[PDB]
């Protein structure tokens, strides 16, 4: 039963804390937590390749893509491993994240600890935007906040 945590911080008001739990190895991962400071609506929520922030969230790299696939949605088969879809910030800018994903893992080759979790500016179009940016970043906009996913107690 592995557990992980990640603290989203950026150069803007957006700040959050997200927890990950995998009670069984190679099984579904529960991702729950809270983000604040967001604009009301949908926001991109992804896991990028590198846990690197020497130059901020931009140092995280692209969406964690170990299988060299196109960008899609959490339920799509054509997706990056880090494609977790969108989170919803309510009228108070609080996103109470609750997600369950079975492609990301806390171990193995799809393992995401030591990688960066990022919440974005715009909304992920799930790879259906009709441009080359849609099949890569989902037109989710700039990187609002990010954090290294580390082992938690």
């Amino acid at each position, epitope marked *: 039963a592995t557990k992980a945590v990640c603290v989203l911080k950026g150069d*803007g*008001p*957006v*700040q959050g804390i997200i927890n990950f739990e995998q009670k069984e190895s190679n099984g579904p991962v529960k991702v729950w937590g809270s983000i*604040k*400071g*967001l*604009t*009301e609506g949908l926001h991109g929520f992804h896991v990028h390749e590198f846990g690197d922030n020497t130059a901020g969230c931009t140092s995280a790299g692209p969406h964690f893509n170990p299988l060299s696939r196109k960008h899609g949605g959490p339920k799509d088969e054509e997706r990056h491993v880090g494609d977790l879809g969108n989170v919803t*910030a*309510d*009228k*108070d*800018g609080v996103a109470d994240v609750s997600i369950e994903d079975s492609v990301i893992s806390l171990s193995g080759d799809h393992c995401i600890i030591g990688r960066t979790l990022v919440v974005h*500016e715009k909304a992920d179009d799930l790879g259906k935007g009709g441009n080359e940016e849609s099949t890569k970043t989902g037109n989710a906009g*700039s990187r*609002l906040a990010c954090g290294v996913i580390g082992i938690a107690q």
Partner: nanobody, 131 residues
Framework: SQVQLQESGGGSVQAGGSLRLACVAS???????????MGWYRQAPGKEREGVAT????????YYSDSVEGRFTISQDKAQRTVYLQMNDLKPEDTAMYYC????????????????????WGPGTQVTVSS
């Protein structure tokens, strides 16, 4: 460079009347994802800073104090970056210098209408009521 606030619309009024308190923000961080919790406040003669209402510039959340009820109504035009604090059904203990202010958009609940967690303040206009 600094988020300057400027209030207006305040003055003298009688008990049981309306008085619009509008404040236009200027300067600072004008990127669209910057969010504040814009709150109107109250320094009564001899008291400390109170706090009447607050709104979110990144959504539509409105939080009020208990001293006020269905008497005030706070709204916003985001394009004009202006917050409107309607003030109808006024009583004589509302006499105070009403300032508006802006705090962090991720300010947790409760601390939203706290004057200590507030960043920048406005000059202020006095809203006196007569009975």
């Amino acid at each position: 460079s600094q988020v300057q606030l400027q209030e207006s619309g305040g003055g003298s009024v009688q008990a049981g009347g309306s008085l619009r308190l509008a404040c236009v923000a200027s300067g600072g961080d004008t990127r669209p994802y910057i969010t504040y919790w814009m709150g109107w406040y109250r320094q009564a003669p001899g008291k400390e800073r109170e706090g009447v209402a607050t709104i979110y510039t990144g959504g539509s959340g409105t939080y009020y104090s208990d001293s006020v009820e269905g008497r005030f109504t706070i709204s916003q035009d985001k394009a004009q970056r202006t917050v409107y604090l309607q003030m109808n059904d006024l009583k004589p203990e509302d006499t105070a210098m009403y300032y508006c202010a802006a705090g962090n958009g991720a300010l947790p609940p409760g601390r939203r209408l706290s004057p200590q967690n507030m960043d920048t303040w406005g000059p202020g206009t006095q809203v006196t009521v007569s009975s």
